[PDB]
Amino acid sequence: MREVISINVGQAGCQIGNACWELYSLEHGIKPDGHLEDGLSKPKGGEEGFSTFFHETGYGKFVPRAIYVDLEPNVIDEVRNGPYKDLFHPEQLISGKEDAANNYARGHYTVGREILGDVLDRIRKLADQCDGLQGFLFTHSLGGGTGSGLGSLLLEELSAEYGKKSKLEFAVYPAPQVSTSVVEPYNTVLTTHTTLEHADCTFMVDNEAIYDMCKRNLDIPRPSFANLNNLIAQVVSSVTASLRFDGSLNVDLNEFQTNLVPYPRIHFPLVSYSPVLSKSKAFHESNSVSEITNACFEPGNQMVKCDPRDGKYMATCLLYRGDVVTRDVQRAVEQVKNKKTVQLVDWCPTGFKIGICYEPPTATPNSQLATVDRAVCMLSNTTSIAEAWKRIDRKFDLMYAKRAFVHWYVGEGMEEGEFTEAREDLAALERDYIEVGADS
Amino acid sequence: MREVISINVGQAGCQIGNACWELYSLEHGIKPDGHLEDGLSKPKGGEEGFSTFFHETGYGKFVPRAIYVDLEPNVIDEVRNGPYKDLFHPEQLISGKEDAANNYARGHYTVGREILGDVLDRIRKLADQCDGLQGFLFTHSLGGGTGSGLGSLLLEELSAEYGKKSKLEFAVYPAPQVSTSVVEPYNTVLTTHTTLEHADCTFMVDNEAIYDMCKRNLDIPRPSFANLNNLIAQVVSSVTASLRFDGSLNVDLNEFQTNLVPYPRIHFPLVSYSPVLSKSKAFHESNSVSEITNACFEPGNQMVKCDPRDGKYMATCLLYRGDVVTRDVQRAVEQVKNKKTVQLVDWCPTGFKIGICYEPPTATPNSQLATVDRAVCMLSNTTSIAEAWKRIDRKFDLMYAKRAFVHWYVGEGMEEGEFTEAREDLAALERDYIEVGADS
Amino acid sequence: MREIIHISTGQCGNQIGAAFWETICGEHGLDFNGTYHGHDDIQKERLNVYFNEASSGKWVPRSINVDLEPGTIDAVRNSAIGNLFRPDNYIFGQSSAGNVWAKGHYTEGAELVDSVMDVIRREAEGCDSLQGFQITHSLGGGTGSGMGTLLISKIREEFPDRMMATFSVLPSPKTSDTVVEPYNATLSVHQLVEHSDETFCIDNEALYDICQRTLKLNQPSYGDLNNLVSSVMSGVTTSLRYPGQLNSDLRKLAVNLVPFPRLHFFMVGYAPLTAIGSQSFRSLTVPELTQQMFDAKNMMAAADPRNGRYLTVAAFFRGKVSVKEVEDEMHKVQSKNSDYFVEWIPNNVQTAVCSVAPQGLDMAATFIANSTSIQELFKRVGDQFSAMFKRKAFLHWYTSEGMDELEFSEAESNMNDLVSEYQQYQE
């Protein structure tokens, strides 16, 4: 339970991985050459970390275990030009000549399953080189059907191969207001049922909410996809901050699973990261722990285009970085219960998880960040996700009436029955999600 | 509960508040830039202030908790050019996108409460930063309908929100001879209507009487608005000096409220401060506080176009700053009992609310009044303001009957009954002040 | 499947293809001889897409120019920029098509179809990453309407997996050198609506209007019109020419722009289509580019979007623009034009921003719309069909050529099937 295999699927998934490996190298101060970087620390690797994501070699060169799978040669050539490919192994990456489809048709078809056997032995060989395993990490956006289709195929094969470690899947959700791809809601709905059968824990992050964050918190005039990748890198690093650096209250990957997966079918936790602000706002006045904990419940930090006040409270987590006073977060959490911001429940409410780690948060030079010695990463399970589910389901049902595109799907690898089953399954998840929440 | 929150509304409100913070930092030896300068220096800490107003955040800056709200972008640019904006926070200083109207017809409309929703959460955030509150402070003017409008609307919102803290509203009253805007008669009457809704204590001040003092006492050829803001900064510095510095007779702000509202409805007590003389005249005169008390009872030191000698005596506060001789005020209260110039009323007679402050008074070098080690403040209730309101009500009634402006008001969202109830309420206030005087 | 071969045919489409290569070597940077001058590596991959790496670092364009009158292809061969042309690229014959749909393919095309298929097969054997064809021809020209419809049908029958993309110019209904010009266009589109999956509508009269307003020239120059449609073609292929925030293939654009195998017609639009020097008078802003794309006369198809109904719209931008800015702009123009934009999709927008910007322009845009008023552009040609040979004038020429009335009624029913789809789907 000391290794976590991370996979980057799709174009946006590969960019998120590169940002995650870049920030992972920035926190430990790791340069393209390294040998650790260099060998003087203790605790920048070794010891852990890096020994959970970076593979240790005989020479000492940390090789970040990443499997960049994609069928677009342009993205593969881009990630190979940078020093990241030198950090990874040339055999770990998979190259593709012709893109699957637009976008989920061939991404989940048997053509995408031809490489399933190749990447399976690659994971088996990678696991044979290292020792131990804690879980499977996935980084693919639900907007891209190729990334969602291939990422689900990797998730189904890994479930039938080992089935012993909890499978984590970081999913990027498109903007519920505007959708560039017309089949984007179709690829997301068809993938939700597949991740339902395979994924033991998911992650819902919206692109529009991130764009609203950097425009308001970071106060940038022009948002960019690199800024979204950097913010996700700060999110992922905050989740595994305890696994990479020791703290006063070290939490495990099973700790999150025993805090974010509370029901036979509930594996959808929301992510919140506070404080996030501009550098000027930090120069004027500082922020207290109570202000940061109250900022965690705001709709902006929830990284989802929905209001969390209408949702019902469930078991949540809160990871803390750097030096953190135990009573200050205790005095803050009792005020939060007294404020009754989110509608509390009669069964769960005693579930505000507090996790402390000694590693302070790092600010990337590309994207601004509130310079503070302590950061808070809130992993909530509020019932506003069903509202986001029903929001994308209404557009899915409104389109599916005429759907304008059914001839291409039923001809390549799909049929009208699979679309109906995914619709009935998504409606069943929303109904079960409301029933378990409104019964209080 | 010792903390005090100040609000700055309107163009004149920000200018008065800027001079208020300028004199505050000048007394405690603090530079207008910040950090510090310097202290928290014997005894600029405890007893507060400077921690009631100049709150010290985690950043280490004694930031004054003030809310500068104004729908005019020019005033926002003026307060941003000064170094106090660096002391303040962009969230404390709410920028005005566009002026509502000229100047109250739309300021008190839905456009006002649209911005009130933004400043309310800022107050909630400010309350979360610094818990505890003693009284709500307001600084605005009646000449600017936007300042009197937004300031009164915010006053009504916080009174319905808490209703437990005092409300000190500083309103600049225009002279009955000059009408810089023909809209101000309707604004003053509608402002008095809103005070009947909610008002704890309102301070009346006329710019004509102040400008007359600078021409006569300060020997100023053309009194500027900066000298008026500095004078108001002086009278508010002496009032809050009972809470800032130590003294043998410390008077609470709520105790001032239980010293200014004897009758079931009293919201408008008059103010007066002395001595206000020239620099060369201050070097030539070395009178005690006894002559200063005798000069404060005169209408010249009232800073308002009202004669306390003509009006009847009522509840009054006598505050003293600096070296105070209890025999000198004993001789002062002896002489005022020997004066018998005003009607010695029967419910009040033995009341001149004593206020003692060990800190010597301090004046700004820009002000022509030299720094005197002794000052007397007489804050009395007088029936002369009832006569002043009657004159304003007569001009408002003449313009209302002519309906030359009511057509533009009902287009902005006004009604005939709204101006009628405002007239009936204002006539009731003058009648009430006549009754409490004639009842002697 | 990243390489695309630019097919060329028609007595006027050859100049469009020649101007296409000229703007290609002028945008990315390439010498007339064939030596590489682009920068740095992404453009070199595009040279592998459109050109062939010859010996001594030379490049040769992958174009198939098949027409008549070899004096024209020899004149453009002596040009300075047209020096890297491979002798196998152009396959010309003798001597003239006579400006008639019959002599283009039925008589002369029967002996050259075997040669042009052997050439396109040799090109397919040398490069296996071929994904689609870019054909530039004249729908009113004799060589274009005759030979163009035959090669498209031959490619559709032999290569059904490969995509189709044409840039045929529509004949002007108001002015015409002869009455047989729109008739050959109707006989051509009778087979183009079945053998082609994508086509672009270009009107010469619309090209004449844009140079009178922006260029402000009395006599329109065909060279400038070739450069305008070249920048349009360059702005369309920029999704594969330069990597951006979201790159889409021609198949990904096709499967999202049409709901049915029909709707091949597309309204073209370019930005900034501003006058010379007007960039200094007016600031280049994205709301201005949207207003130009919404103008009825700025389109070169050309149809009136107000009279019609917006079926599917797609505006691909180039340069440095904000994602949230264009998202708010596309949301505002969809709310204020809710009567024009269709509402059951409900969002029929499909944008693809390019990272780099064209040379000399801070930002560019290529808008493709689908309206229902385009049926009027087919009706007027259909009306000309029933108004030209209804008098049975010059019918002895078509009877001697071997044409029958069965293909004329089939072309009429195809137009009837089109206008029916225009109102299915009512306006």
mmCIF file with all atom_site columns, N, CA, C and O in Angstrom, chain A residues 11 74 77 98 102 177-178 180 182 208 215 222-223 225 399 402 404-405 407-408, chain C residues 1 46 243 245-246 252 255-256 258-259 322 324-325 327 330 344-345 347 349 351:
data_model
loop_
_atom_site.group_PDB
_atom_site.id
_atom_site.type_symbol
_atom_site.label_atom_id
_atom_site.label_alt_id
_atom_site.label_comp_id
_atom_site.label_asym_id
_atom_site.label_entity_id
_atom_site.label_seq_id
_atom_site.pdbx_PDB_ins_code
_atom_site.Cartn_x
_atom_site.Cartn_y
_atom_site.Cartn_z
_atom_site.occupancy
_atom_site.B_iso_or_equiv
_atom_site.pdbx_formal_charge
_atom_site.auth_seq_id
_atom_site.auth_comp_id
_atom_site.auth_asym_id
_atom_site.auth_atom_id
_atom_site.pdbx_PDB_model_num
ATOM 1   N N  . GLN A 1 11  ? -6.378  13.879 -24.304 1.00 0.00 ? 11  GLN A N  1
ATOM 2   C CA . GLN A 1 11  ? -5.559  15.077 -24.473 1.00 0.00 ? 11  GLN A CA 1
ATOM 3   C C  . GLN A 1 11  ? -5.516  15.898 -23.190 1.00 0.00 ? 11  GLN A C  1
ATOM 4   O O  . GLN A 1 11  ? -4.437  16.235 -22.691 1.00 0.00 ? 11  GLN A O  1
ATOM 5   N N  . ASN A 1 74  ? -0.070  14.359 -32.166 1.00 0.00 ? 74  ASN A N  1
ATOM 6   C CA . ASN A 1 74  ? 0.382   15.705 -31.828 1.00 0.00 ? 74  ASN A CA 1
ATOM 7   C C  . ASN A 1 74  ? 0.603   15.851 -30.327 1.00 0.00 ? 74  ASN A C  1
ATOM 8   O O  . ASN A 1 74  ? 1.619   16.407 -29.892 1.00 0.00 ? 74  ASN A O  1
ATOM 9   N N  . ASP A 1 77  ? 3.664   13.820 -29.307 1.00 0.00 ? 77  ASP A N  1
ATOM 10  C CA . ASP A 1 77  ? 4.912   14.481 -29.674 1.00 0.00 ? 77  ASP A CA 1
ATOM 11  C C  . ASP A 1 77  ? 5.191   15.674 -28.769 1.00 0.00 ? 77  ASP A C  1
ATOM 12  O O  . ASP A 1 77  ? 6.352   16.017 -28.520 1.00 0.00 ? 77  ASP A O  1
ATOM 13  N N  . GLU A 1 98  ? -3.928  7.362  -35.405 1.00 0.00 ? 98  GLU A N  1
ATOM 14  C CA . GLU A 1 98  ? -5.204  7.922  -35.836 1.00 0.00 ? 98  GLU A CA 1
ATOM 15  C C  . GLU A 1 98  ? -6.167  7.945  -34.659 1.00 0.00 ? 98  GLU A C  1
ATOM 16  O O  . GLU A 1 98  ? -6.318  6.940  -33.956 1.00 0.00 ? 98  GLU A O  1
ATOM 17  N N  . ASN A 1 102 ? -15.167 10.683 -32.653 1.00 0.00 ? 102 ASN A N  1
ATOM 18  C CA . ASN A 1 102 ? -15.667 11.916 -32.052 1.00 0.00 ? 102 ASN A CA 1
ATOM 19  C C  . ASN A 1 102 ? -16.961 11.586 -31.309 1.00 0.00 ? 102 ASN A C  1
ATOM 20  O O  . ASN A 1 102 ? -18.053 11.697 -31.868 1.00 0.00 ? 102 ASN A O  1
ATOM 21  N N  . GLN A 1 177 ? -23.235 25.165 -18.939 1.00 0.00 ? 177 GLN A N  1
ATOM 22  C CA . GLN A 1 177 ? -23.905 26.214 -19.702 1.00 0.00 ? 177 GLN A CA 1
ATOM 23  C C  . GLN A 1 177 ? -23.721 26.009 -21.203 1.00 0.00 ? 177 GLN A C  1
ATOM 24  O O  . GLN A 1 177 ? -24.697 25.867 -21.946 1.00 0.00 ? 177 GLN A O  1
ATOM 25  N N  . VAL A 1 178 ? -22.473 25.993 -21.663 1.00 0.00 ? 178 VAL A N  1
ATOM 26  C CA . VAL A 1 178 ? -22.150 25.844 -23.077 1.00 0.00 ? 178 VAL A CA 1
ATOM 27  C C  . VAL A 1 178 ? -21.325 24.578 -23.258 1.00 0.00 ? 178 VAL A C  1
ATOM 28  O O  . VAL A 1 178 ? -20.488 24.242 -22.412 1.00 0.00 ? 178 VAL A O  1
ATOM 29  N N  . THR A 1 180 ? -19.008 22.659 -26.243 1.00 0.00 ? 180 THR A N  1
ATOM 30  C CA . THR A 1 180 ? -18.402 22.767 -27.567 1.00 0.00 ? 180 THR A CA 1
ATOM 31  C C  . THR A 1 180 ? -18.761 21.570 -28.439 1.00 0.00 ? 180 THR A C  1
ATOM 32  O O  . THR A 1 180 ? -19.161 21.735 -29.597 1.00 0.00 ? 180 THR A O  1
ATOM 33  N N  . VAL A 1 182 ? -21.094 18.462 -29.554 1.00 0.00 ? 182 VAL A N  1
ATOM 34  C CA . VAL A 1 182 ? -22.512 18.129 -29.474 1.00 0.00 ? 182 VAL A CA 1
ATOM 35  C C  . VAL A 1 182 ? -22.719 16.756 -28.846 1.00 0.00 ? 182 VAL A C  1
ATOM 36  O O  . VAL A 1 182 ? -23.754 16.508 -28.215 1.00 0.00 ? 182 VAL A O  1
ATOM 37  N N  . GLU A 1 208 ? -15.860 25.418 -15.960 1.00 0.00 ? 208 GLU A N  1
ATOM 38  C CA . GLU A 1 208 ? -16.371 26.779 -15.836 1.00 0.00 ? 208 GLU A CA 1
ATOM 39  C C  . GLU A 1 208 ? -16.175 27.318 -14.424 1.00 0.00 ? 208 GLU A C  1
ATOM 40  O O  . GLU A 1 208 ? -15.894 28.507 -14.239 1.00 0.00 ? 208 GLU A O  1
ATOM 41  N N  . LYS A 1 215 ? -10.545 34.010 -12.422 1.00 0.00 ? 215 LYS A N  1
ATOM 42  C CA . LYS A 1 215 ? -10.931 35.360 -12.814 1.00 0.00 ? 215 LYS A CA 1
ATOM 43  C C  . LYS A 1 215 ? -11.297 36.221 -11.611 1.00 0.00 ? 215 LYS A C  1
ATOM 44  O O  . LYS A 1 215 ? -11.067 37.434 -11.632 1.00 0.00 ? 215 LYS A O  1
ATOM 45  N N  . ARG A 1 222 ? -7.277  36.945 -18.775 1.00 0.00 ? 222 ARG A N  1
ATOM 46  C CA . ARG A 1 222 ? -7.410  35.908 -19.801 1.00 0.00 ? 222 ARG A CA 1
ATOM 47  C C  . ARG A 1 222 ? -7.156  34.536 -19.194 1.00 0.00 ? 222 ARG A C  1
ATOM 48  O O  . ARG A 1 222 ? -5.997  34.185 -18.911 1.00 0.00 ? 222 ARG A O  1
ATOM 49  N N  . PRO A 1 223 ? -8.191  33.728 -18.975 1.00 0.00 ? 223 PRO A N  1
ATOM 50  C CA . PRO A 1 223 ? -7.969  32.361 -18.498 1.00 0.00 ? 223 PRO A CA 1
ATOM 51  C C  . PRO A 1 223 ? -7.319  31.501 -19.573 1.00 0.00 ? 223 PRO A C  1
ATOM 52  O O  . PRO A 1 223 ? -7.413  31.773 -20.771 1.00 0.00 ? 223 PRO A O  1
ATOM 53  N N  . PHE A 1 225 ? -5.939  27.146 -20.400 1.00 0.00 ? 225 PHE A N  1
ATOM 54  C CA . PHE A 1 225 ? -6.018  25.741 -20.011 1.00 0.00 ? 225 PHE A CA 1
ATOM 55  C C  . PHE A 1 225 ? -4.851  25.337 -19.118 1.00 0.00 ? 225 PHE A C  1
ATOM 56  O O  . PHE A 1 225 ? -4.978  24.401 -18.321 1.00 0.00 ? 225 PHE A O  1
ATOM 57  N N  . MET A 1 399 ? -32.028 16.345 -25.859 1.00 0.00 ? 399 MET A N  1
ATOM 58  C CA . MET A 1 399 ? -31.361 16.025 -27.114 1.00 0.00 ? 399 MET A CA 1
ATOM 59  C C  . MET A 1 399 ? -31.802 14.663 -27.636 1.00 0.00 ? 399 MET A C  1
ATOM 60  O O  . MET A 1 399 ? -32.131 14.513 -28.818 1.00 0.00 ? 399 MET A O  1
ATOM 61  N N  . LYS A 1 402 ? -34.543 13.735 -30.500 1.00 0.00 ? 402 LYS A N  1
ATOM 62  C CA . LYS A 1 402 ? -34.224 13.739 -31.921 1.00 0.00 ? 402 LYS A CA 1
ATOM 63  C C  . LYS A 1 402 ? -32.778 13.355 -32.182 1.00 0.00 ? 402 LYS A C  1
ATOM 64  O O  . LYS A 1 402 ? -32.480 12.742 -33.215 1.00 0.00 ? 402 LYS A O  1
ATOM 65  N N  . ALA A 1 404 ? -30.202 13.731 -33.535 1.00 0.00 ? 404 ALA A N  1
ATOM 66  C CA . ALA A 1 404 ? -29.524 14.259 -34.717 1.00 0.00 ? 404 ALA A CA 1
ATOM 67  C C  . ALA A 1 404 ? -28.301 13.462 -35.175 1.00 0.00 ? 404 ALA A C  1
ATOM 68  O O  . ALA A 1 404 ? -27.716 13.780 -36.214 1.00 0.00 ? 404 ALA A O  1
ATOM 69  N N  . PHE A 1 405 ? -27.908 12.420 -34.434 1.00 0.00 ? 405 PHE A N  1
ATOM 70  C CA . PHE A 1 405 ? -26.639 11.753 -34.699 1.00 0.00 ? 405 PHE A CA 1
ATOM 71  C C  . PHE A 1 405 ? -26.689 10.244 -34.491 1.00 0.00 ? 405 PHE A C  1
ATOM 72  O O  . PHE A 1 405 ? -25.631 9.602  -34.502 1.00 0.00 ? 405 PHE A O  1
ATOM 73  N N  . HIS A 1 407 ? -27.388 7.740  -36.219 1.00 0.00 ? 407 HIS A N  1
ATOM 74  C CA . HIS A 1 407 ? -26.969 6.839  -37.287 1.00 0.00 ? 407 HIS A CA 1
ATOM 75  C C  . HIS A 1 407 ? -25.484 6.509  -37.193 1.00 0.00 ? 407 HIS A C  1
ATOM 76  O O  . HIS A 1 407 ? -25.068 5.395  -37.530 1.00 0.00 ? 407 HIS A O  1
ATOM 77  N N  . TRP A 1 408 ? -24.668 7.463  -36.739 1.00 0.00 ? 408 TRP A N  1
ATOM 78  C CA . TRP A 1 408 ? -23.232 7.213  -36.634 1.00 0.00 ? 408 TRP A CA 1
ATOM 79  C C  . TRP A 1 408 ? -22.916 6.268  -35.479 1.00 0.00 ? 408 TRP A C  1
ATOM 80  O O  . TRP A 1 408 ? -22.004 5.439  -35.578 1.00 0.00 ? 408 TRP A O  1
ATOM 81  N N  . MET C 2 1   ? -4.151  9.173  -40.377 1.00 0.00 ? 1   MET C N  1
ATOM 82  C CA . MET C 2 1   ? -4.949  9.903  -41.353 1.00 0.00 ? 1   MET C CA 1
ATOM 83  C C  . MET C 2 1   ? -4.875  11.407 -41.105 1.00 0.00 ? 1   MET C C  1
ATOM 84  O O  . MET C 2 1   ? -5.812  12.008 -40.582 1.00 0.00 ? 1   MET C O  1
ATOM 85  N N  . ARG C 2 46  ? 3.240   19.771 -41.323 1.00 0.00 ? 46  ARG C N  1
ATOM 86  C CA . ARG C 2 46  ? 2.249   20.175 -42.314 1.00 0.00 ? 46  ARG C CA 1
ATOM 87  C C  . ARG C 2 46  ? 2.806   20.077 -43.729 1.00 0.00 ? 46  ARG C C  1
ATOM 88  O O  . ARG C 2 46  ? 2.046   19.844 -44.677 1.00 0.00 ? 46  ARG C O  1
ATOM 89  N N  . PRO C 2 243 ? -1.421  23.638 -33.829 1.00 0.00 ? 243 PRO C N  1
ATOM 90  C CA . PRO C 2 243 ? -2.096  23.173 -32.613 1.00 0.00 ? 243 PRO C CA 1
ATOM 91  C C  . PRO C 2 243 ? -2.649  24.337 -31.806 1.00 0.00 ? 243 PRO C C  1
ATOM 92  O O  . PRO C 2 243 ? -2.010  25.384 -31.676 1.00 0.00 ? 243 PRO C O  1
ATOM 93  N N  . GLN C 2 245 ? -6.044  25.363 -28.612 1.00 0.00 ? 245 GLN C N  1
ATOM 94  C CA . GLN C 2 245 ? -6.686  24.907 -27.384 1.00 0.00 ? 245 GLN C CA 1
ATOM 95  C C  . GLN C 2 245 ? -7.529  23.661 -27.617 1.00 0.00 ? 245 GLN C C  1
ATOM 96  O O  . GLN C 2 245 ? -7.631  22.807 -26.730 1.00 0.00 ? 245 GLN C O  1
ATOM 97  N N  . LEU C 2 246 ? -8.137  23.537 -28.796 1.00 0.00 ? 246 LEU C N  1
ATOM 98  C CA . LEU C 2 246 ? -8.942  22.364 -29.129 1.00 0.00 ? 246 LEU C CA 1
ATOM 99  C C  . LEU C 2 246 ? -8.888  22.174 -30.636 1.00 0.00 ? 246 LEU C C  1
ATOM 100 O O  . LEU C 2 246 ? -9.473  22.963 -31.384 1.00 0.00 ? 246 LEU C O  1
ATOM 101 N N  . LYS C 2 252 ? -14.657 15.218 -37.433 1.00 0.00 ? 252 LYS C N  1
ATOM 102 C CA . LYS C 2 252 ? -15.286 15.706 -36.212 1.00 0.00 ? 252 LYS C CA 1
ATOM 103 C C  . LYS C 2 252 ? -16.133 16.944 -36.475 1.00 0.00 ? 252 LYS C C  1
ATOM 104 O O  . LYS C 2 252 ? -17.160 17.141 -35.817 1.00 0.00 ? 252 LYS C O  1
ATOM 105 N N  . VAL C 2 255 ? -19.432 15.503 -38.515 1.00 0.00 ? 255 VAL C N  1
ATOM 106 C CA . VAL C 2 255 ? -20.417 14.784 -37.715 1.00 0.00 ? 255 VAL C CA 1
ATOM 107 C C  . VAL C 2 255 ? -21.154 15.705 -36.752 1.00 0.00 ? 255 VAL C C  1
ATOM 108 O O  . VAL C 2 255 ? -22.178 15.307 -36.189 1.00 0.00 ? 255 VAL C O  1
ATOM 109 N N  . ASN C 2 256 ? -20.658 16.925 -36.538 1.00 0.00 ? 256 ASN C N  1
ATOM 110 C CA . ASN C 2 256 ? -21.324 17.879 -35.664 1.00 0.00 ? 256 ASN C CA 1
ATOM 111 C C  . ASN C 2 256 ? -22.025 19.002 -36.417 1.00 0.00 ? 256 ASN C C  1
ATOM 112 O O  . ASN C 2 256 ? -22.836 19.715 -35.816 1.00 0.00 ? 256 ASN C O  1
ATOM 113 N N  . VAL C 2 258 ? -23.725 18.517 -39.529 1.00 0.00 ? 258 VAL C N  1
ATOM 114 C CA . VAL C 2 258 ? -24.899 18.019 -40.242 1.00 0.00 ? 258 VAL C CA 1
ATOM 115 C C  . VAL C 2 258 ? -25.571 16.935 -39.407 1.00 0.00 ? 258 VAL C C  1
ATOM 116 O O  . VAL C 2 258 ? -24.884 16.087 -38.814 1.00 0.00 ? 258 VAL C O  1
ATOM 117 N N  . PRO C 2 259 ? -26.900 16.938 -39.302 1.00 0.00 ? 259 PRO C N  1
ATOM 118 C CA . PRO C 2 259 ? -27.582 15.858 -38.576 1.00 0.00 ? 259 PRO C CA 1
ATOM 119 C C  . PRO C 2 259 ? -27.828 14.642 -39.458 1.00 0.00 ? 259 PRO C C  1
ATOM 120 O O  . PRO C 2 259 ? -27.931 13.514 -38.967 1.00 0.00 ? 259 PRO C O  1
ATOM 121 N N  . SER C 2 322 ? -9.961  35.096 -25.449 1.00 0.00 ? 322 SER C N  1
ATOM 122 C CA . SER C 2 322 ? -10.349 34.477 -24.190 1.00 0.00 ? 322 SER C CA 1
ATOM 123 C C  . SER C 2 322 ? -11.493 33.497 -24.418 1.00 0.00 ? 322 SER C C  1
ATOM 124 O O  . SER C 2 322 ? -12.425 33.773 -25.178 1.00 0.00 ? 322 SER C O  1
ATOM 125 N N  . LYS C 2 324 ? -13.701 32.417 -22.119 1.00 0.00 ? 324 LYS C N  1
ATOM 126 C CA . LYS C 2 324 ? -14.918 32.906 -21.483 1.00 0.00 ? 324 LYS C CA 1
ATOM 127 C C  . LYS C 2 324 ? -15.505 34.098 -22.232 1.00 0.00 ? 324 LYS C C  1
ATOM 128 O O  . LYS C 2 324 ? -16.723 34.308 -22.202 1.00 0.00 ? 324 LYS C O  1
ATOM 129 N N  . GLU C 2 325 ? -14.661 34.883 -22.905 1.00 0.00 ? 325 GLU C N  1
ATOM 130 C CA . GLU C 2 325 ? -15.160 36.040 -23.644 1.00 0.00 ? 325 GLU C CA 1
ATOM 131 C C  . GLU C 2 325 ? -16.006 35.610 -24.834 1.00 0.00 ? 325 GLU C C  1
ATOM 132 O O  . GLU C 2 325 ? -17.112 36.121 -25.041 1.00 0.00 ? 325 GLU C O  1
ATOM 133 N N  . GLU C 2 327 ? -17.391 32.762 -25.152 1.00 0.00 ? 327 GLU C N  1
ATOM 134 C CA . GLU C 2 327 ? -18.537 32.025 -24.631 1.00 0.00 ? 327 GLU C CA 1
ATOM 135 C C  . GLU C 2 327 ? -19.669 32.974 -24.256 1.00 0.00 ? 327 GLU C C  1
ATOM 136 O O  . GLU C 2 327 ? -20.848 32.668 -24.471 1.00 0.00 ? 327 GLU C O  1
ATOM 137 N N  . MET C 2 330 ? -21.036 34.358 -27.738 1.00 0.00 ? 330 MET C N  1
ATOM 138 C CA . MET C 2 330 ? -21.901 33.408 -28.430 1.00 0.00 ? 330 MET C CA 1
ATOM 139 C C  . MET C 2 330 ? -23.209 33.202 -27.676 1.00 0.00 ? 330 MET C C  1
ATOM 140 O O  . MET C 2 330 ? -24.231 32.851 -28.279 1.00 0.00 ? 330 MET C O  1
ATOM 141 N N  . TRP C 2 344 ? -34.377 23.751 -30.563 1.00 0.00 ? 344 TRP C N  1
ATOM 142 C CA . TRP C 2 344 ? -34.553 22.397 -30.052 1.00 0.00 ? 344 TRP C CA 1
ATOM 143 C C  . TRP C 2 344 ? -33.241 21.635 -29.912 1.00 0.00 ? 344 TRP C C  1
ATOM 144 O O  . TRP C 2 344 ? -33.252 20.504 -29.413 1.00 0.00 ? 344 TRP C O  1
ATOM 145 N N  . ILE C 2 345 ? -32.118 22.218 -30.322 1.00 0.00 ? 345 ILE C N  1
ATOM 146 C CA . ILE C 2 345 ? -30.819 21.562 -30.193 1.00 0.00 ? 345 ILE C CA 1
ATOM 147 C C  . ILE C 2 345 ? -30.396 21.506 -28.726 1.00 0.00 ? 345 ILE C C  1
ATOM 148 O O  . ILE C 2 345 ? -30.047 20.419 -28.243 1.00 0.00 ? 345 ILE C O  1
ATOM 149 N N  . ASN C 2 347 ? -28.299 24.395 -28.297 1.00 0.00 ? 347 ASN C N  1
ATOM 150 C CA . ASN C 2 347 ? -27.052 25.094 -28.600 1.00 0.00 ? 347 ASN C CA 1
ATOM 151 C C  . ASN C 2 347 ? -26.409 24.423 -29.808 1.00 0.00 ? 347 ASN C C  1
ATOM 152 O O  . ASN C 2 347 ? -25.797 23.358 -29.689 1.00 0.00 ? 347 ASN C O  1
ATOM 153 N N  . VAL C 2 349 ? -23.895 25.632 -31.571 1.00 0.00 ? 349 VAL C N  1
ATOM 154 C CA . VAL C 2 349 ? -22.630 26.327 -31.777 1.00 0.00 ? 349 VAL C CA 1
ATOM 155 C C  . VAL C 2 349 ? -21.491 25.324 -31.663 1.00 0.00 ? 349 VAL C C  1
ATOM 156 O O  . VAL C 2 349 ? -21.537 24.401 -30.838 1.00 0.00 ? 349 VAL C O  1
ATOM 157 N N  . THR C 2 351 ? -17.323 25.865 -31.881 1.00 0.00 ? 351 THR C N  1
ATOM 158 C CA . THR C 2 351 ? -16.162 26.717 -32.087 1.00 0.00 ? 351 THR C CA 1
ATOM 159 C C  . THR C 2 351 ? -14.875 25.919 -31.911 1.00 0.00 ? 351 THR C C  1
ATOM 160 O O  . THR C 2 351 ? -14.840 24.909 -31.204 1.00 0.00 ? 351 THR C O  1
#
